[PDB]
Amino acid sequence: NQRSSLRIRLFNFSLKLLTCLLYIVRVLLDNPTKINWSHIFWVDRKLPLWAVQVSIALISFLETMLLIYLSYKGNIWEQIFRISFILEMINTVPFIITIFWPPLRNLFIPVFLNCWLAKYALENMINDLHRAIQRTQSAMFNQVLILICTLLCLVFTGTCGIQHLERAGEKLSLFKSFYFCIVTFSTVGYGDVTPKIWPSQLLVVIMICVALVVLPLQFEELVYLWMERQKSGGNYSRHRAQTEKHVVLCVSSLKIDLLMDFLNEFYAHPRLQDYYVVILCPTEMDIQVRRVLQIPLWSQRVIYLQGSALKDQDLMRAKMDNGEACFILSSRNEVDRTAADHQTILRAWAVKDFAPNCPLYVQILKPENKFHVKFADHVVCEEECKYAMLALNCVCPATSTLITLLVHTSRGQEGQESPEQWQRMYGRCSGNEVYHIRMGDSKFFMEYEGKSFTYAAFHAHKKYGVCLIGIRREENKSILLNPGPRHIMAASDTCFYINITKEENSAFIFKQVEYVKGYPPNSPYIGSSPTLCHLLPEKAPFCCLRLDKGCKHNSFEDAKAYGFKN
Amino acid sequence: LIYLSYKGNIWEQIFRISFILEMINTVPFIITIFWPPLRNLFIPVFLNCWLAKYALENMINDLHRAIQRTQSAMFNQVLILICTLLCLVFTGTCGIQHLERAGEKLSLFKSFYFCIVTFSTVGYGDVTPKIWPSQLLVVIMICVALVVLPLQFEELVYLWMERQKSGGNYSR
């Protein structure tokens, strides 16, 4: 069972601690050349403290009897000779003997070894939670809890053992033995408290041998599990997530090139500065990136959590369902392009299945893979945009630069210290950034309702220095880049404009062969944009496309022989 | 500082170690302004050592806005590992020196001898604790020492030995 089993573990675990707790009580209450072995064997225990330990002993004795009947698989020698059974029979059977024999109530029984039986209950209790199989973070903390118990139970057995034998000569209290034990295990050796009796000498010899083997392996395994939770682990909590804002970044492998461009872009805006940026990444913390997250600014903000976006346990760490964004990014400079893009599609589907309400921002390399993540709110194909810049760089001089400076959010304070004329104005004009505000609401475009779009563009640039780009209507969702004189403005038309600073922030400006037009028939990918492109009347053959070998159509070997105008 | 970086949760900021060590040290000094008999009362101000270390880590990492500084990263990280060793000793010296006033009255230097002996696992027993609180402190100080200090030294040696192979600067 899951529920019915766990209660019996806690029942035995609590009873075994209660016997050790009652042992702490009787030591504090009961207190008193040749060695007086009377003080080792005879112990003036109280009747109520005795009677409770016997009732616990009978319960725990019957539990081991009952458990044998359940899991008896041929060999009883297999079960009796184990350590858990031997420690039971050392502790519990003497308490049963004291029921039948009346003079043996004062006789000593080493009940303190129930500490290890309580540890065996905890290991048995903890591993009932691994019926669900996958629980990576809970595995680390609960395993650490057992390593703490081994350290405590080794000390508890040492304290009790040495405190008991020292009754013979040089009578130590329970606390003096705890001081003595933790000193001897630490290998300090003050010699302020010492053993001076034949049995106690031999116990301390054994306790050092057990300590020097076990304890260093316990600490180094404890540190291994503790240090692994720093790199791998980290959970964005419910208390934090419900109250605060929260954003996720799914990625294969972070770098300084990728991260610093994102963090500077994201926290450049005023309203975004309160947000928290969680990371999801299968690979470990890099050496370079650890310095960036250590900085005071990004120490509070950014939370790097290891684990891929595909597994649903790693989504419960980040808690995407609460968060307001889920960035996915394709792995550039990977051995295979198609495999990297196929992974971002699976991440997109893994995110959408878990958290449907999150707006899915995604980046893909190849254009054919756009269709599969067209359901997502915002898509940026690298190949589509990349080659479009280069095409425009042939007609227009430097559109590559033009678009890069608009999308990168900056303000006019770059290269102002430099001595050159061009460089001051270049960095100022680089601060330009696209914005959007309605007509009636905007202080820029108040008295321009009856007038046209073109008329407003001149007077905006003349007075303020803020040129328009396009308009979005109320009904139409589409953006319309530069209407002519036909488009008249309205009360609520979203004007897109270019300015160094946004209007709402910027109060400082106010105070201070023939061809035929048609859509190309064969689109090489599914989700492609159809446009009119000056098509050929006849569909050309594949041979005539090649220059090098002149086929039976127009035999020209080189490109100069064609005689290209322009 | 709370007003500047308040992002929804105040429980997120109050329950941190840097804030708790502040309220343990600074708030009693504010209580002594209003109450006149409590000037002689003890306040454990020595824990400001760790608050000074938290200032140094916060100070040092302001220099990583330039991103790439590989040699400066190693030396300044070593400086923090030296502070942890000193501040652990300083807290130990002050703590044990304070409690031993009750019985067997040690000076500041005798506690420094006592502390660095106990952390090194030598255990002379020339100087010892013989009082109920001081016994319990030394039990805690050994547990903190035996976990932290070996990890501090081996990380210190890692950064020191890495500067030999990787590092080396031809000076001006």
């Binding site: 005023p270 005071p296 600014l297 303000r411 600073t501 709402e504 922030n505 910027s506 109060a507 400082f508 | 500082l1 007003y3 500047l4 970086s5």
Partner: peptide, 18 residues
């Protein structure tokens, strides 16, 4: 930057943190 930069909070935030 009137809304973002010029405020009682951000004057102190630029001085301390940023």
């Amino acid at each position: 930057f009137y809304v973002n930069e010029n405020t009682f909070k951000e004057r102190l935030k630029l001085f301390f943190i940023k």
